[PDB]
């Protein structure tokens, strides 16, 4: 039977575009540029394969005749996004698709359905959490992932699950981001950790109700090599990374010789200003003391810059330098009005954690690490 259906343009366009986003922009063979459209029982399923991410969406549709067809996904996405706001009629006539909408008509070639690779089956459901929480947590840690395929152990986001407790972590050896959250597990005895390619999972974090993650059940979590993500009539699978995440928990300092807090916007603006004279944007210097932070950069040849802002500060004064891009990345990932810093020495990692404007800093130390759902640990750079 030849597929023939009608549905509202906005629904078609959103569904197709969501599946087509993952297709290669330079597919090796035409079949890999395709999306599969399958119509049956008052619904249209749109499916897309890619070696790393596969995806599938079902939307309601008036199905005049059931069937399946394979056509170019990106092209179909571009067309449906630009069609008139009229019902879209779609019928397959032999090896060609006739798409009609208001005063517009398209005739598209089809490809061999039997040559499209099979989409992987979603693993058993593992647990659920709000879409908003999931996208935020991923966005927070994804900024710290490496982006160099030659160091694949850095290109992932680690997902640890211990019952109701989920930990996400990422590092590129210069910053480490760790986000803890609680979710609703769907089976007992879940105690596992997997590694998901960061670029994939990060971009996918961009509205919904609840998201369902499917990595298996019980002791089987992680065994299928896939992370399923579902919600709102959409499902996707992401292939897991075979690399091994570094042993990051021994990096987390339990005690600080100094703590500080600053307004995130003020500090961000000050870093951007002084970094204007930093060579290659390589470093900015933070001198902490006396409820003041002296932020400086530059050198004699190109110019020197300083800006002093008010901070809360306790413990041993120190001067410590950072990559200003990595510093701003960390400040922007806190998602809070203020930042709390924890320091040991100018040559050892600095701990950044969210603080609200209703938090306040104190004795003169030493200071136990404060429990926090999010940490961004940043290696300093050497002072000149």
């Amino acid at each position: 039977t030849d597929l023939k259906f009608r549905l509202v343009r906005e629904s078609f366009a959103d569904a197709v575009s969501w599946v087509a986003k993952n297709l290669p922009t330079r597919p090796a063979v035409p079949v890999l540029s395709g999306v599969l459209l399958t119509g049956s029982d008052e619904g249209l399923t749109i499916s897309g394969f890619d070696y790393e991410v596969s995806a599938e969406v079902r939307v309601p549709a008036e199905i005049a005749s059931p069937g399946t067809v394979l056509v170019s996904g990106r092209l179909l996405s571009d067309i449906t996004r630009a069609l008139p706001n009229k019902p879209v009629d779609f019928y397959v006539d032999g090896n060609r698709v006739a798409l009609t909408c208001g005063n517009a008509r398209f005739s598209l070639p089809t490809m061999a359905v039997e040559d499209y690779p099979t989409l992987p089956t979603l693993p058993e459901d593992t647990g659920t959490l709000p879409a908003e929480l999931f996208s935020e947590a991923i966005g927070q840690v994804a900024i710290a992932a490496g982006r160099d395929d030659t160091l694949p152990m850095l290109t992932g986001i680690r997902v640890e699950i211990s019952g109701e407790k989920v930990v996400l972590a990422a590092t590129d050896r210069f910053r480490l981001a760790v986000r803890e959250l609680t979710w609703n597990a769907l089976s007992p005895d879940i105690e596992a950790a997997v590694l998901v390619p960061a670029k994939t999972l990060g971009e996918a974090a961009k509205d919904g109700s609840e998201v369902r993650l499917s990595l298996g059940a019980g002791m089987g979590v992680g065994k299928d090599g896939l992370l399923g993500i579902s919600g709102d009539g959409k499902r996707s699978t992401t292939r897991l990374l075979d690399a091994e995440f570094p042993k990051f928990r021994q990096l987390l300092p339990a005690e600080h010789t100094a703590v500080a807090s600053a307004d995130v916007a003020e500090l961000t603006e000050a870093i951007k200003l002084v970094a204007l004279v930093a060579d290659r944007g390589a470093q900015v210097r933070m001198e902490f003391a006396d409820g003041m932070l002296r932020l400086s950069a530059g050198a004699d040849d190109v110019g020197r810059a300083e800006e002093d802002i008010a901070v809360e500060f306790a413990g041993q004064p120190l001067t410590i330098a950072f990559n200003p891009t990595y510093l701003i990345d960390g400040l922007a990932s806190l998602h809070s009005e203020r930042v709390s810093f924890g320091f040991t020495t100018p040559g050892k990692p600095a701990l950044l954690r969210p603080a609200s404007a209703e938090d306040r800093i104190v004795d003169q130390g030493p200071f136990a690490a404060v429990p926090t759902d999010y940490v961004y640990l940043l290696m300093p750079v050497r002072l000149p």
């Binding site: 590092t171 050896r173 210069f174 570094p246 042993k247 990559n323 990692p349 290696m379 750079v381 050497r382």
Partner: peptide, 10 residues
């Protein structure tokens, strides 16, 4: 430009 004291890793 030192790395985090990841072991191994640096």
């Amino acid at each position: 430009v030192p790395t985090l004291p990841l072991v191994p890793x640096g």
